[PDB]
């Protein structure tokens, strides 16, 4: 049997059995609905799992613990249907390439009511982190609500980005500056929170956020499936944004390598990736998979921007303790 351990719902209804009818493999899969359970039984040494889905956060920091082995690319000959971009991206957290396959992958940006920011914006485009940075702009939004999130990594990087400064830069005094351009919009930010974003812009309760693809997606949807007209859209903004992966890796304990690598391979084909996109609503890193995907998905630039989006894309790397402390300090002072 080969064990795999995902996010729930995060795969397309007939992957498996396609999977198995195709190898013979038999395949026990397991899912969780939080990173931490994942990190957990990864840390310890022994989760009885072949595969695991983690972010590339969190390989990035737990390669050099050995948490993963290398893989072996001779059993990976569909290795050649990724694309360089992404994969070269992908190095910042995996140097070589050397442990990690990609998997799904998405962004953060701007989610936001359209008819709501017409009101006060008028047809502005939404196409800038000026929607969020600048006074101009917050200013007028504040009367509908925007909403921001609640830790440093992520919205500091961003800031960083927005000023051109380099998201992952150790450097106090780029922090200073990010931070002088947070303090100045902090007035007009209704709450600062992990997660509160998703049901309020659903509901119509705000106008903006800064947000992840995924989240914002799960807002529109149940903007739809509400039934009030309540109109979703997602933005990656032309600076930039962060590139975030999920990822497929074999532990260091892993038994069954080679039913592993099958697993892999074939995750890797393009008629199998596309139904996983068109299922989850994710971008996956296979070009030939673009064609076989719905419309919705392929043709959305929500989930594939345009390619001068693309090129400003950044991975976060390992930062040193250090920096992570500074991170929290600054983001403490700015609420």
């Not at 957290?93 to 962004?107: C, E, K, M, R």
């Not at 919705?296 to 402390?325: F, G, I, N, T």
Request: proline share 6%.
């Amino acid at each position: 049997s080969l064990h795999i351990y995902n996010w729930t719902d995060y795969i397309a209804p007939t992957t498996l059995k396609d999977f198995t009818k195709e190898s013979g493999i038999d395949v026990s899969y397991d899912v969780f609905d939080s990173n931490e359970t994942l990190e957990g039984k990864l840390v310890s040494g022994h989760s009885g799992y072949d595969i695991v889905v983690p972010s590339n956060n969190f390989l990035g920091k737990q390669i050099q613990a050995g948490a993963f082995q290398k893989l072996d690319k001779s059993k990976l000959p569909n290795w050649k249907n990724l694309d360089p971009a992404l994969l070269k991206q992908l190095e910042v957290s995996d140097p070589g390439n050397q442990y990690a396959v990609p998997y799904l992958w998405g962004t953060n940006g701007i989610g936001y009511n359209v008819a709501k920011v017409k009101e006060v914006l008028g047809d502005q485009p939404i196409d800038s982190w000026a929607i969020l940075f600048e006074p101009e702009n917050m200013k007028k939004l504040a009367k509908c609500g925007v909403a921001f999130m609640d830790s440093g990594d992520e919205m500091l990087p961003a800031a960083l980005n927005y000023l051109g400064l380099d998201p992952n830069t150790h450097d106090p005094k780029d922090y200073k500056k990010a931070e002088e351009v947070l303090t100045k919009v902090r007035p007009y930010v209704s709450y600062f929170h992990s997660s509160k974003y998703i049901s309020d812009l659903a509901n119509g309760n705000i106008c903006v956020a800064f947000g992840y693809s995924g989240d914002v997606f799960q807002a529109a949807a149940r903007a739809e499936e509400a039934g009030k007209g309540i109109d979703i859209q997602y933005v990656i903004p032309k600076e930039g944004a962060n590139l975030w992966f999920d990822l497929m890796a074999i532990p260091a304990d892993a038994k069954a390598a080679d039913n592993a690598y099958a697993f892999i391979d074939y995750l890797l084909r393009p008629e199998v990736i596309a139904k996983v996109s068109d299922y989850v609503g994710y971008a996956n890193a296979i070009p030939g998979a673009r064609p076989l995907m719905d419309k919705s998905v392929s043709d959305s630039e929500e989930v594939y921007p345009p390619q001068a989006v693309l090129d400003k894309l950044y991975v976060s790397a390992v930062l040193p303790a250090k920096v992570l402390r500074l991170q929290t300090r600054t983001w403490t002072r700015i609420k």
